[PDB]
Amino acid sequence: EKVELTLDPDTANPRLILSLDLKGVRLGERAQDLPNHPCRFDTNTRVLASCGFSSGRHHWEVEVGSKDGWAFGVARESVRRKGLTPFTPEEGVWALQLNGGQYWAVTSPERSPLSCGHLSRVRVALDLEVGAVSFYAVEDMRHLYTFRVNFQERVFPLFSVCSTGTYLRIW
């Protein structure tokens, strides 16, 4: 079922720029002086939605920038917030990424280069019963990639922007 997400400003890395409607995120030039919430990503340029899921099937849609430097998908609640944490499934993050002009599923120890054409808006489908996170290009709902995961805890929508000049935006 459809979920209306808002970004959680307590989690946001201080270099990120969130939109006032808490749907949009970009990377800024300099770090804002933000109160040090324990949930805040102090180093990785990440932000979670406020909503986490422990059961059921849920979907949302993400508008993506055409320029390099984003990743999104889901993170387990216990993802490390403090220090430079590897962006890997073992560290509790399951994401797609645009980097070096190439779409990737962020697998380890090697990322997986995807076949897809240019992406504009992507549906993310989280199933905690089946144990799946799936991505679709919204135009014709074409499957891009599925991670099979045995989720053991609450899972949050995850967004990351690591370059100026691109963005992610919840639809």
Residue numbers in the entry: 340 to 510
Q: Please, what does the article write about this entry?
A:
Tripartite motif (TRIM)7 is an E3 ubiquitin ligase that was first identified through its interaction with glycogenin-1 (GN1), the autoglucosyltransferase that initiates glycogen biosynthesis. Human TRIM7 is a 511-amino acid protein that displays the canonical TRIM/RBCC motif followed by a B30.2 C-terminal domain. TRIM7B30.2 structure reveals the typical B30.2 domain fold consisting of two antiparallel β-sheets of seven (β1, β2, β4, β9, β10, β11, and β13) and six (β3, β5, β6, β7, β8, and β12) strands, arranged as a distorted β-sandwich. The TRIM7/GNIP1–glycogenin interaction was shown to be mediated by the B30.2 domain, whereas the CC domain was involved in the protein self-association.
To contribute to the understanding of the mechanism of action of TRIM7, we solved the X-ray crystal structure of its B30.2 domain (TRIM7B30.2) in two crystal forms at resolutions of 1.6 Å and 1.8 Å. Even though the packing of the molecules in the two crystal forms is different, the structure of the four independent molecules is very similar, showing backbone root mean square deviations (RMSD) smaller than 0.5 Å for all pairwise comparisons. During the refinement process, electron density that fitted well to a malonate ion from the crystallization solution was observed in a positively charged cavity found on one side of the pocket, in all four TRIM7B30.2 molecules from both crystal forms. Malonate is in the same position in three of the four molecules (chain A from the 1.6 Å resolution structure and both chains in the 1.8 Å resolution structure) hydrogen-bonded to Thr384, Arg385 and Ser499. In the fourth molecule, this carboxylate group does not interact with a symmetry-related molecule and consequently exhibits a different orientation. Furthermore, despite almost certainly being a nonnatural ligand of TRIM7B30.2, malonate binding reveals the existence of a potential binding site for negatively charged regions of such partners. During the refinement process, additional electron densities connected to Cys378, Cys390, and Cys501 were observed in the Fobs-Fcalc map in both crystal forms. Only Cys455, whose side chain points into the core of the β-sandwich, appears not to be modified according to the electron density maps.
